[PDB]
């Protein structure tokens, strides 16, 4: 009878319940598709872990909007039925759109939720608004750092200035990219697991006794770039870090490290460039994290400025690195005049910035006054999908 919180995020999908405190529901948005020489597609974690022939890995928030509204679909139509299995008649519903989503967009989202699946109610928030609310503030400025998307949006009143957004495409994926050529500088194959069932006592700095599965059929380029890239997430999440201070080539380099077993268990204590790497986003024609807050809070008026230079909220999957904050923190009161109070929101947690968007998209879907600021199927039904113009801020 809960309304169900749909985050669709840049490269993980966040679902649950209204009154849950956590997405119960989570998966990678890639998926898979084949075509007659059918398009049914494979979704979730454990269906795309299969190797398969002509299987791809496709996403369908390729510019942080839905691109793909057959494979948007798609996953929408397993989440519903599957993960979170109900029917969709019965439940209400609230999407998390980007900040800067286009009006048609919406429009052709709201067709094909209110249409294909029958739902009765319906509501539509930008995902800055969301973190913003979760964190408990109705003014701030909301850095996202997701996957191929990182943007600062700034929000008052709940209300996000379109002004003030700077999107930097200095995201996750980028640092994860970043890894990938480091460790050409490592002179390591990038080999995934799927390929890899073995393992040794193999020495530091020693080519690993690693041995393939050998009558797995023959993978796709784009399914073995995605199985690459999970397993340089999965190392970089674990081994980055962010300097305190810009890297200057510190005593022996960083003093001791991790030293982190690759899936083919050989590796090498990562040195300075577990530092480097994080630094792509600040030392990059680009802008910088902190370039992009600072021209952003610069873009809107200085009546605001204070709230947002005081409440700048963090959140995003690529944010949970090690000292991130403090070196963004460091950086940004730096370049911040100084008569203006600066401040983070410790909310460091994997779960508060991962899921940021959901949670507010929780506390949101909760209220009782959810039910007179959604969108009713019978406003649909005399009004039409231009209804979610209106009815969404």
């Given at each position: 009878?809960?309304?169900?919180?749909?985050?669709?995020?840049?490269?993980?999908?966040?679902?649950?319940?209204?009154?849950?405190?956590?997405?119960?529901?989570?998966?990678?948005?890639?998926?898979?598709?084949?075509?007659?020489?059918?398009?049914?597609?494979?979704?979730?974690?454990?269906?795309?872990?299969?190797?398969?022939?002509?299987?791809?890995?496709?996403?369908?928030?390729?510019?942080?909007m839905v691109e793909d509204w057959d494979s948007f679909q798609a996953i929408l139509d397993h989440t519903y039925k599957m993960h979170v299995k109900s029917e969709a008649s019965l439940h209400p519903v609230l999407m998390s759109e980007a900040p800067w989503n286009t009006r048609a967009k919406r429009?052709?989202?709201?067709?094909?939720?209110?249409?294909?699946?029958?739902?009765?109610?319906?509501?539509?928030?930008?995902?800055?608004?969301?973190?913003?609310?979760?964190?408990?503030?109705?003014?701030?400025?909301?850095?996202?750092?997701?996957?191929?998307?990182?943007?600062?949006?700034?929000?008052?009143?709940?209300?996000?200035?379109?002004?003030?957004?700077?999107?930097?495409?200095?995201?996750?994926?980028?640092?994860?990219?970043?890894?990938?050529?480091?460790?050409?500088?490592?002179?390591?194959?990038?080999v995934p697991p799927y390929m890899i069932a073995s393992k040794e006592a193999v020495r530091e700095g020693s080519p690993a006794n690693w041995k393939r599965k050998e009558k797995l059929p023959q993978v796709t380029r784009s399914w073995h770039n995605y199985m690459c890239n999970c397993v340089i997430q999965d190392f970089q999440a674990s081994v980055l870090q962010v300097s305190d201070s810009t890297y200057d080539e510190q005593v022996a380099a960083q003093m001791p490290?991790?030293?982190?077993e690759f899936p083919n268990g050989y590796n090498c204590d990562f040195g300075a460039e577990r530092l480097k790497i994080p630094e792509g986003l600040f030392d990059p024609t680009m802008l910088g994290v902190?370039?992009?807050?600072?021209?952003?809070?610069?873009?809107?008026?200085?009546?605001?400025?204070?709230?947002?230079?005081?409440?700048?909220?963090?959140?995003?999957?690529?944010?949970?690195?090690?000292?991130?904050?403090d070196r963004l923190n460091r950086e940004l009161s730096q370049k911040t005049p100084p008569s203006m109070r600066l401040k983070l929101i410790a909310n460091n947690t994997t779960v508060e910035r991962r899921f940021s968007s959901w949670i507010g998209g929780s506390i949101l879907a909760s209220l009782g006054t959810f039910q007179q600021m959604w969108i009713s199927k019978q406003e649909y039904e005399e009004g039409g999908k231009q209804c979610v113009e209106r009815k969404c801020p």
């Open positions: 009878v809960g309304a169900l919180v749909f985050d669709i995020g840049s490269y993980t999908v966040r679902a649950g319940y209204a009154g849950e405190d956590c997405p119960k529901v989570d998966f990678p948005t890639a998926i898979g598709m084949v075509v007659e020489r059918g398009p049914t597609y494979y979704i979730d974690t454990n269906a795309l872990r299969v190797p398969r022939e002509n299987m791809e890995a496709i996403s369908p928030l390729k510019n942080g429009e052709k989202l709201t067709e094909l939720m209110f249409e294909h699946y029958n739902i009765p109610a319906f509501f539509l928030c930008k995902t800055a608004v969301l973190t913003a609310f979760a964190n408990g503030r109705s003014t701030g400025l909301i850095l996202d750092s997701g996957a191929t998307h990182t943007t600062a949006i700034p929000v008052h009143d709940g209300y996000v200035l379109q002004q003030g957004i700077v999107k930097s495409p200095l995201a996750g994926d980028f640092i994860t990219m970043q890894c990938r050529e480091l460790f050409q500088e490592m002179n390591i194959e990038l490290t991790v030293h982190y902190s370039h992009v807050v600072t021209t952003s809070v610069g873009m809107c008026d200085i009546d605001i400025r204070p709230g947002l230079y005081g409440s700048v909220i963090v959140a995003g999957g690529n944010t949970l690195i090690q000292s991130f904050t």
